A = this chain, B = another copy of it.
Amino acid sequence: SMLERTINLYPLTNYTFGTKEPLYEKDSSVAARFQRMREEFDKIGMRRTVEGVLIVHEHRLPHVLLLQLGTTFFKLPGGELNPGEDEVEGLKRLMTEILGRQDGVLQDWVIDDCIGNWWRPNFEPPQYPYIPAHITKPKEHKKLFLVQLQEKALFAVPKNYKLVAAPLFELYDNAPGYGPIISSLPQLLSRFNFIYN
C-alpha cells in the first residue's frame, strides 16, 4: 500500500529567471488561430499538442510555473508537434525553445509521467477530457506531462512573458481565471507523493 509515484520538489529560490528576446505567437488573433487550425487539418489531420507541468515549493507549499503573456492569458510551456515527431522528444524541443538559455547550455528535462489528455471536437474553443459522443474526427489532441526539475537551474524567459508561481489553492475551482485544463491541475496532481527538499 505504497502505490503513489514519489516526486522531488525544490524551493523557488533555487531557480534563476533571466530574460531573452520576445517569442511571438504564430496567430495574431482567435480568428487567425481557428483559420490556421482548419488549413493544417485539411493538409496533415488532427493537431497534436504537448504541454509540461513544472512544480516547485516555497515553505513546503507546492506551486505550478505558468507563463503569462503580458497581463493577458496564462499558459503552460508547450506547443505543436510536427508530423511523425515523438511526443516526449517534441515537448523537450518546445521547452528548450521557450525557456532554454541565451548562453546555449543544455537543460536536463526528465519526463516520466502522463497527467492527462484533452480533445477539441470542432474549430471552436470547447475542450473535453474524453472524445465526446458522435465525434469521429477530433480537430486537436493535447497531452500533459509532469516535468521533474533538477535541484537548481537558470531559465531564460522571453521579454514579452512573465514566469509566475501559482499555489494550488489559487487554481482550484477557477476556470473563469485559468480555463478548464489549468484549473483541474490540483485534482490531477493529488496522486503524487511530493518530497519538499
Contact = CB atoms under 8 A, between A and B. Distances in A.
Interface of A: 1, 3-4, 61-62, 86-89, 111-118, 128-130, 132-133, 145, 167-169, 172-173, 180, 184, 186-191
Nearest to A115: B191
Contact of A168 (B86, B129, B168): B129
Nearest to A87: B1
8 A-B pairs with least C-beta separation: A116-B190, A129-B190, A1-B87, A1-B88, A117-B190, A184-B187, A129-B186, A1-B86
A189 to B, nearest CB: 8
A61 B133 contact: yes
Contacts of A86: 1
